[PDB]
Amino acid sequence: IQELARALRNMIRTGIIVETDLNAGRCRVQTGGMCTDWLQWLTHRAGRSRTWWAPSVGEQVLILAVGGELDTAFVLPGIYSGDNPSPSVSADALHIRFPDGAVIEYEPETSALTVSGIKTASVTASGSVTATVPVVMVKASTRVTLDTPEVVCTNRL
Amino acid sequence: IQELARALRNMIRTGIIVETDLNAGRCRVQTGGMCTDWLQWLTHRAGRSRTWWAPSVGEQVLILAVGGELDTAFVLPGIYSGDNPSPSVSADALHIRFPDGAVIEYEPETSALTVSGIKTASVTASGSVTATVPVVMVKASTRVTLDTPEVVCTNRL
Amino acid sequence: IQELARALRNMIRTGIIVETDLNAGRCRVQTGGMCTDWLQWLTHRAGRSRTWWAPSVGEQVLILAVGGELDTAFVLPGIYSGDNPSPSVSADALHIRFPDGAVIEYEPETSALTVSGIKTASVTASGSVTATVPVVMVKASTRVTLDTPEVVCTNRL
Numbered sequence: 001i002q003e004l005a006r007a008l009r010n011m012i013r014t015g016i017i018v019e020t021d022l023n024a025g026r027c028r029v030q031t032g033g034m035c036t037d038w039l040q041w042l043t044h045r046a047g048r049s050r051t052w053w054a055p056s057v058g059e060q061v062l063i064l065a066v067g068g069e070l071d072t073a074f075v076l077p078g079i080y081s082g083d084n085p086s087p088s089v090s091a092d093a094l095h096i097r098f099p100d101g102a103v104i105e106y107e108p109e110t111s112a113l114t115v116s117g118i119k120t121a122s123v124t125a126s127g128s129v130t131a132t133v134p135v136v137m138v139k140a141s142t143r144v145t146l147d148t149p150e151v152v153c154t155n156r157l
Numbered sequence: 158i159q160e161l162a163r164a165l166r167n168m169i170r171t172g173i174i175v176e177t178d179l180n181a182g183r184c185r186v187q188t189g190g191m192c193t194d195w196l197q198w199l200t201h202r203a204g205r206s207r208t209w210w211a212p213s214v215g216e217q218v219l220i221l222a223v224g225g226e227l228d229t230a231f232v233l234p235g236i237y238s239g240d241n242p243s244p245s246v247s248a249d250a251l252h253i254r255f256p257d258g259a260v261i262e263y264e265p266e267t268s269a270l271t272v273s274g275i276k277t278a279s280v281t282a283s284g285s286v287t288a289t290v291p292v293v294m295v296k297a298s299t300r301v302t303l304d305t306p307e308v309v310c311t312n313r314l
Numbered sequence: 315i316q317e318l319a320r321a322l323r324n325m326i327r328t329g330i331i332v333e334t335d336l337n338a339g340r341c342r343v344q345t346g347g348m349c350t351d352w353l354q355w356l357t358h359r360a361g362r363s364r365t366w367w368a369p370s371v372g373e374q375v376l377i378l379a380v381g382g383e384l385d386t387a388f389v390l391p392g393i394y395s396g397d398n399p400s401p402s403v404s405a406d407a408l409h410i411r412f413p414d415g416a417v418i419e420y421e422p423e424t425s426a427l428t429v430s431g432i433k434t435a436s437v438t439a440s441g442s443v444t445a446t447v448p449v450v451m452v453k454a455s456t457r458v459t460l461d462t463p464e465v466v467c468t469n470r471l
């Protein structure tokens with residue numbers, strides 16, 4: 001029958017985000033000769049842990065229709081394109097490129113953890129922050145301020 | 158035929174996690190008028206790099222059936238709900254909210270990297286940990302301990 | 315009809331990565347009695363933010379065919395296997411295991427943020443890096459170097 005085939009071909013589609021609604025957490029997607037209604041996108045976690053990282057206009061995605069009584073569809077980022085190419089060719093590295101030019105990266109080849117291209121950086125811990133490593137370098141252009149009752153240097157200078 | 162249509166509608170479904178098996182890495186999901194058998198969930202990576210971040214009871218997910226000789230199905234988190242709403246409305250930020258209230262976040266708008274709401278924090282490196290930035294502030298309520306043969310302050314006090 | 319059923323069963327498949335092309339960002343996958351052509355894989359983000367974390371040979375994945383005029387298919391990691399088992403059983407923790415043995419982990423149970431098993435670690439910020447916590451420990455086997463015009467210890471020693 002002719003629409004079982006229509007339902008099957010529309011079950012999984014690919015397309016481009018054309019509009020986002022950050023409050024609703026929904027987007028509209030151009031796929032084939034139409035633009036979808038407002039669809040939710042899948043995120044990494046939406047349970048006891050919750051992630052948020054909104055897809056952007058121009059981002060290529062899959063659209064998965066559930067069909068049935070419900071008949072909703074969901075958006076799943078993301079697919080590399082000419083406009084949005086892979087930011088790396090590394091065999092094993094996790095590489096994250098933010099639109100401000102910042103990079104978060106771990107490269108298992110050199111075992112190098114890299115954060116760069118940012119302005120601010122804050123860690124607020126209630127108990128302990130420790131660091132255990134042969135060499136530590138701080139290159140402060142302005143000054144390092146040590147707001148504490150106490151600093152123990154263990155040996156020499 | 159009437160079950161091609163049944164297979165098609167059951168190919169992609171949405172539902173809610175009702176039980177987890179952390180040892181097996183499987184979950185059961187309520188979808189429509191039934192609860193699935195124990196299904197594996199998809200994770201970010203399961204190769205040379207491996208991720209683990211178990212979905213939780215109450216989390217809304219997609220279920221994707223492979224059909225065929227195999228006929229298995231897999232669970233894919235996650236979809237925002239009333240119980241589990243988006244933890245942010247930020248246009249570009251990666252925002253992670255843990256159930257202990259901790260937040261990991263980078264906001265490209267302010268280029269601010271944020272870790273907060275945690276107790277402990279440990280970095281164990283075999284070689285070098287360096288930090289290159291104009292201003293550095295440490296606000297230790299108790300004390301900072303510098304267990305090293307040597308600390309070079311490069312200029313003044 | 316006999317190939318609506320063939321299209322339906324081939325719509326969603328599972329298989330194993332047998333070859334990768336890091337430049338093209340494509341992989342070939344063994345599924346059933348065949349190996350696919352070069353298929354793109356889905357990544358976390360491919361928009362204003364862009365992620366890269368290539369799947370590896372031996373990694374079990376889903377393959378999603380879009381059918382239709384396009385008829386392409388996309389690869390979605392990842393599924394735990396005997397070769398690539400879950401690196402954790404933790405109820406709430408995000409756990410990342412790199413092939414160099416490094417671990418990135420937050421465990422909400424103990425509220426402990428863990429980075430370990432790495433060699434290098436660099437943060438390059440243009441403005442501020444601050445840290446706000448009762449206890450701070452640095453255990454430098456070799457030396458800590460403070461390349462700054464100024465360090466203010468706020469009280470005592």
Ligand SMILES: [Cl-]
Nearest residue numbers: 044200201358
């Ligand atoms: Cl992800």
